[PDB]
Amino acid sequence: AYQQKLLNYFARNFYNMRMLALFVAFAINFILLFYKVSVHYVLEESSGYMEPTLRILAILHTVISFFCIIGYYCLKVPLVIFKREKEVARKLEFDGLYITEQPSEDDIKGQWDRLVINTQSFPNNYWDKFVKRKVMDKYGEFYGRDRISELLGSAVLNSIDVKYQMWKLGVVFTDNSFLYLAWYMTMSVLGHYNNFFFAAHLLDIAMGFKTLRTILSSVTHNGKQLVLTVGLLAVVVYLYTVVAFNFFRKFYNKSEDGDTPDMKCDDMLTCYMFHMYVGVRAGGGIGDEIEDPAGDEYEIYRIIFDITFFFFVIVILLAIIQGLIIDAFGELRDQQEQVKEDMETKCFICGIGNDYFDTVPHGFETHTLQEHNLANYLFFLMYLINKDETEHTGQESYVWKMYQERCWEFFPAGDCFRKQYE
């Protein structure tokens, strides 16, 4: 049980451990700033033993990553497995989806749980270990008592539900944050092998400073728009590659003066990558990094081609991409501000407004220090759970009955107490 006592030390101290791991990664890439071609080796504008401290801190950082994944596995994984078990247990009772409704081959995340029905610890975290016989006696009349009830059903090695444990890992692995921390551990391991790409732990400045997190959410908000627009740009570039191939290949010499061993780029499989690497990030369109007409036959067609490339790439489409990203930022900051607005001019529950609770001075703040003050519904619900059944009042039995009924009319819609009276 001293193992469990040491296990308490982790999850009590998770966030500070993660922040300190970020601090270690800063220090290591600060050291790794000093490299030099020779095989690579580091000088020292520092103490004499900086390379042994690098040898220290690599192991130290990998220790902290393993430390924090143990802490996270025994911190929040029970909550996630709880939410999953609760959702599945409600969908056995109120739906019978493995009994009647039969979810399709679509939604494998909802279809993973077919091999956890007959597991014996399906109510691990559900406070209700009698779901089995409950759905049996609610349904097994019709679909066979025997089939339905059968479908529900080294010593420590011989006292653990193995299939349930497999299912548990199967729900562990699909999680975002667990996948992130496992990736982070494996990158600390493969920087412990080769410390060249041990610098990939700079990504945590995003995941963990909570405004850069909005910045990095703003790269994937408008996914289908941005991908389709970039594909559109590739189509325009390809079409101009067709024109430049079929009519203007005599303007392609990277070489100096052409008597030097001149190189062209009028090919369909080359001219394309030329306009991509050169013409897209050019800024001058294409007329910088190309031959210019000086009295040719095709001079006017050339200038038309140049101006249309300039307009329909550098003027418009780069501004489209920029405007799409800055539009995503505007909407994200607007959602942040709207959250912090309607957290201050409305009650979350009675939903009335600020102004009505301001005829009385200081009133809205009292209207959420006394009246609704969302923590108290949490507390009162704990109070109802923890008392015995037999000592409920009329209102307490009423609310308990509604909550067992799941019908939700006792929450006030637009009817605070002060509205009722004069």
């Binding site: 308490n8 999850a11 009590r12 029970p78 909550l79 709880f82 939410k83 609760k86 975290n125 406070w127 959602q335 709207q338 959250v339 309607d342 957290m343 979350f348 529950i349 009675c350 006394q370 009246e371 609704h372 003050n373 923590a375 108290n376 519904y377 949490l378 507390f379 009162f380 619900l381 704990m382 109070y383 759970i385 009329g394 209102q395 307490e396 009423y398 609310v399 909550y403 799941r406 939700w408 009319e409 006792f410 929450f411 006030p412 009817d415 605070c416 107490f417 009722q420």
Partner: protein, 107 residues
């Protein structure tokens, strides 16, 4: 609670008012410990409940992790949600927050 209930339900009466002024020192101890919410208890009007807050439950609710779970929840609900299903999302939050609260007690 009973003096509180007489005060809140029946204000403007000087006799109870004087008596509560002579009863001031007890409420000031127990004002953190009683809570009071609003419901409609089948009477088709607004009733008021009073109840008890356990000390350890509150004082281990408000600190550690549950503040961030709260933020997450408030963010997700105020940003988006159907107008009637919001309260069921709140009860789902309340349920697993109670489970998390016991688990944070378990440390």
């Amino acid at each position: 609670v009973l003096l509180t209930n007489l005060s809140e339900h029946m204000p403007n009466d000087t006799r109870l008012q004087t008596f509560l002024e002579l009863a001031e020192s007890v409420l000031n101890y127990f004002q953190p410990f009683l809570g009071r919410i609003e419901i409609m208890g089948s009477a088709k009007r607004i009733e008021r409940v009073y109840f008890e807050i356990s000390e350890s439950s509150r004082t281990q609710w408000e600190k550690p992790q549950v503040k961030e779970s709260k933020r997450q929840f408030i963010f997700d609900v105020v940003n988006e949600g159907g107008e009637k299903e919001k309260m069921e999302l709140f009860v789902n939050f309340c349920e697993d927050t109670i489970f998390e609260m016991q688990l944070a007690a378990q440390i």
